[PDB]
Amino acid sequence: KDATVNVSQNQTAIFTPDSTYDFSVLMTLSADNDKTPDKYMTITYIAKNNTFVLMPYLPNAVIDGGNTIKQICEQSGEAEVAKLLSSKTGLSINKYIRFTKSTLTELFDMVGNTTLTVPSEIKYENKKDNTVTIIKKGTQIFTAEQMYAYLTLPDYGVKDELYPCKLNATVISSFIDQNFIGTSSKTLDEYINFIINFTNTNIEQSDYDAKVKAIVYTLSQNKSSVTDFYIPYGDKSGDDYIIDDNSWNSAKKALGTG
Secondary structure, rough: OOOOOOOOOOOOOOOOOOHOOOOOEEEEEEOOOOOOOOEEEEEEHHHOEEEEEEEEEEEEEEEEOOOOOHHHHHHHHHHHHHHHHHHHHHHOOOOEEEEEEHHHHHHHHHHHHHHEEEEOOEEEEEEOOOEEEEEOOEEEEHHHHHHHHHHHOOOOOOOOOHHHHHHHHHHHHHHHHHOOOOOOOOHHHHHHHHHHHOOOOOOOOOHHHHHHHHHHHHHOOOOOOEEOOOOOOEEEEOOEEOOOHHHHHHHHHHHHOO
8 A cells, every 4th residue: 555656857957867877897808809808897887976986807716606707708708707797796787898909909099098106117027928028117108008018917026816906907997087087978979989899899879878978977077086996805716716705795885786
């Protein structure tokens, strides 16, 4: 015998995005179109908080008691990875973008440079191709190719198994804050035109058109930052990284899903 009491929308009112504008996208990176992605990161837009939450995962991360994220992505694609991540986080992840070295570098080159503080000098000796990668210490302006090489180093000279995730979360947060805050729908239309036409994605034009109003709203706010990140933690088990069950609860709090 519950009461039927409905209040219609103000209609003429100034636009303020509600929870219907919230979305998640699984983003992955491969060396090229033949190889399995090595990097995995979700991006969750929380319209109420005008923020984008990033969650990176190690390729050898075990999130179901079975195979690694990478193994699952090889066998069943990003859709399966996004499904397993949806069940564990309370998120509704259906869309994904699989970048390659080429398409991710082109995205960065198109959007703009990022200024990052390198905590200590890196001189990485790559034993696959016999090359040395030199990243100097300090606050510096990173171009597309410099940005890509920094983000994808196989070793940062740190014991921390989560450090490549922490670096990727931070560097991508900086990239979004420095180049997307204050952007127009016209500019964002160039970015999405590139995503839809040259990346491996299931994002359609209708998906972007239903969300761009909230995206432009959030980025047009007087904020120094529109990003946040949570790092899913766990433990080493052979060559696997078993995600701790207590991390999913901290992840739920960071997204406001549980």
